[PDB]
Symmetry: C2
Subunit: 71 residues, 2 copies
């Protein structure tokens, strides 16, 4: 259980794009109401999960970096 | 088994007002993004359930009101 800085960046980048894409598509889906209403909970879950997993990465990399403070 | 449009109307009324409240709440949350993200799945479920219940009543009331109780 160890990841390098390259793996970290690529992984974070992947997660960032993952969360951002879903978040943007959800914003559009909110306007696509009773059209894509059957898909509401999908993107809602995905956006929540993506950002929760993003946080899961943040909390894990924090302990790794000894990252306990901000800039 | 007897259909009464008035109490059904009150039922629909209560659902309409509820769905309307949930719709604006969801809309607010959608623009209030990277905030309230922890409540995304909750609110989204409400709106979906409300819509699904609106559709439900609409299908149910149509099947019933397409008949006629004599009194």
């Amino acid at each position: 259980m160890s990841e390098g800085a390259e793996e970290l960046k690529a992984k974070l980048k992947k997660l960032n794009a993952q969360a951002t894409a879903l978040k943007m598509d959800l914003h559009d889906l909110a306007e696509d109401l009773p059209t894509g209403w059957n898909r509401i909970m999908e993107v809602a879950e995905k956006t929540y999960e993506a950002y929760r997993q993003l946080d899961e990465f943040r909390k894990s990399t924090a302990s790794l970096e000894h990252h306990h403070h901000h800039h």
